């Protein structure tokens, strides 16, 4: 099944944050309506934040997270969770190797903001 794709409400501000837990450098791309809206790159084995940004979901609401290490696409796992019918999290895990911890890059998208 496709993973790392989420339909947000249109024209909404949202936060995107990425963490790294790998000896490899993680590159995280966030596409909005199929155009790169944020790119984070960094390396950590201690859950360091490698980037955070505020974005707007635009007219489509379509947000996609992609992860690669040295040009190789990581395998993704994802889900969206809504608390009290208001607070939204779109969560992404990624695996760059063999151990299947799926934490190599971790991406959290939250809305609403403000």
């Amino acid at each position: 099944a496709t993973q790392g794709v989420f339909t947000l409400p249109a024209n909404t501000r949202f936060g995107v944050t990425a963490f790294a837990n790998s000896s490899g450098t993680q590159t995280v791309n966030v596409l909005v309506n199929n155009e790169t809206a944020a790119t984070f790159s960094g390396q950590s084995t201690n859950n360091a934040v490698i980037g955070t940004q505020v974005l707007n979901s635009g007219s489509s609401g379509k947000v996609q997270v992609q992860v690669s290490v040295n040009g190789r696409p990581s395998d993704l796992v994802s889900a969206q969770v809504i608390l009290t019918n208001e607070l939204n999290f779109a969560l992404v895990g990624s695996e760059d190797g063999t151990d299947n911890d799926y934490n190599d890059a971790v991406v959290v998208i939250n809305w609403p903001l403000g």
Copy 2:
């Protein structure tokens, strides 16, 4: 129902990151085994990371998130989500006022790390 309390696997490192979306200064307290392990404070209406730390769940695995604004306990909502039977997120939202956006402080706990 109790919110913002999670049983993690014992003796496990976990990430805890807090975001602010409110006029009010948010104070996030993270307890492990009922003892304060981290305190974040900050103010933003643009989802600024007001703190991020790596902690250990210790022998109990009992982790609790509290949020207060100027001393007043915020109302919490929470859940845990597990992807591919491996990647864990504990999520907390909090409301300091009347608008019920539940984003005033947002706390994300993730494990495993490394």
Copy 3:
């Protein structure tokens, strides 16, 4: 925080299924746009399905689950989870006593159907 309230897409069919795990008879009311759309009652300590129905979300898409036992409203816990940006689950547990298993009635809403 309010629990047991979910905003579905408007004019969309959804499944609702209730399960009981208590010595007391459980009454589950499902409201659509603030009007009773279905009512289920049953007693089980073995997770028996005490009711199932297909309903329409109507123009608001607002769906509310209420649970009571012998007249007394149960304490509710809820969340919505979306998998592969497509498959929606609205989940409710409820507590009628002191043991805090929150399974005394369990209500599962799923969409889309067909």
Copy 4:
């Protein structure tokens, strides 16, 4: 990533319920410790509950959901969510064709019971 596989606490009762939303006959198999513990089959475009059962997770606690149509394995999606640190749902969707609604068989596992 592996989908439809869940680690439960050992020797615990859980409910499993399957729903169908397809013109094809769905076969849902539930494995405990890699052995078939329940089987449900049926065809519905209206969210019929094609089966519900109470099982015991056994000594491993490993539970797996498999779905097929006419012997062809369906693509699965899954997650686990925990409410008030107590109430557990393991959720599975499955796709038998090309439209990617992932609702063709839906399976929900809940614990604890009683």
